[PDB]
């Protein structure tokens, strides 16, 4: 979009590893651990991705995920206050979400999710994919674990509130295999070569992403070997077609193997807000 020069703003200045308290494992990501922490300037309760120490390829782009959460604004998006380097641990320092990870939510409360509290999260959710494809970025781990619950909605007046988590590793430098494992999330042209990234891919993550929602956090092709997965996308497979029928169209009409048919998030958010008249 219009950032000049975003990686050389990123400061390793104004989070020291001194401030910064670490608390329990909460999560892993693709080469990541999770934590809650502390930043002293009062002090504020944060999240810290750490990344696994790495080569400099992928610390990189680590990195590069972090500077692209820091340039965008938008209010279902996660804030990154910073990155702090902590001897060989590269970290993202993000605002802490007390609601939680979206699939551990829903796995908990499987019995009360309503249909209006669903499409919600999905609106919710199109709406930041939408300010990204906007600006020409690309995600890459779109699912319900990187979703974060900042009000939960079942018996408040007010609805759910959910913020999208950074991207952690970009699938640009991902091994084959760690891309495998990322279906059936991962666009199948990403598995034929992480260099096929695009916007489009995202697309395809909300699909996926939409089918865990409506089957209440389960996880698709739960202990698949990675060959069978591999199976999965080799016949053009898509994950069992939800009862919800409004969101099982907009999962399929996402789910095209040909990156170029699946319909912009412009459009989706319009079909979105027409279900609702």
């Known amino acids: 979009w219009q950032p000049v020069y975003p990686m050389s703003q990123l400061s ?7 401030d910064l308290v670490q608390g329990e494992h909460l999560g892993r990501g693709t080469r990541t651990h999770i934590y809650s922490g502390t930043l002293m300037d009062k002090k504020i309760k944060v999240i810290l991705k750490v990344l696994d120490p790495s080569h400099r390829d992928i610390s990189l782009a680590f990195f590069e995920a972090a500077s692209m959460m820091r340039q965008v604004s938008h209010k279902h998006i996660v804030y990154l206050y910073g990155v702090c380097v902590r001897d060989v641990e590269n970290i993202m320092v993000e605002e802490f979400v007390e609601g939680g990870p979206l ?8 019995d009360v999710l309503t249909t209006p509290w669903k499409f919600k999260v999905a609106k919710q959710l199109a709406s930041a994919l939408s300010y990204l494809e906007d600006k020409d ?10 979703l974060l619950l900042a009000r939960e909605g079942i018996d408040s007046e007010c609805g759910p509130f959910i913020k999208l988590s950074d991207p952690g590793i ?3 430098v991902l091994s084959r295999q760690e891309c495998i494992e990322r279906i ?5 042209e990403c598995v034929e070569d ?8 995202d697309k395809w993550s909300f699909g996926t992403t939409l089918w865990e929602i409506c089957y209440n956090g389960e996880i698709p092709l739960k202990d698949k070997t990675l060959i069978e997965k591999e ?8 994950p069992v077609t939800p009862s919800c029928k409004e969101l099982a169209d907009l999962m399929t009409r996402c789910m095209n193997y040909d990156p170029n048919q699946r319909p912009f998030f412009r459009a989706i958010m319009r079909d979105i807000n027409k279900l609702e008249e």
């Open 12 to 18: 390793f200045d104004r989070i020291l590893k001194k």
């Open 103 to 110: 699939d551990l939510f829903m796995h908990r409360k499987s």
């Open 137 to 146: 970025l690309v995600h890459g781990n779109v699912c319900t674990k990187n």
């Open 170 to 172: 970009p699938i640009t």
């Open 184 to 188: 059936p999330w991962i666009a199948p």
């Open 194 to 201: 992480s260099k096929n990234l695009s916007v489009a891919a």
């Open 231 to 238: 199976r999965f996308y080799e016949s053009r497979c898509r």
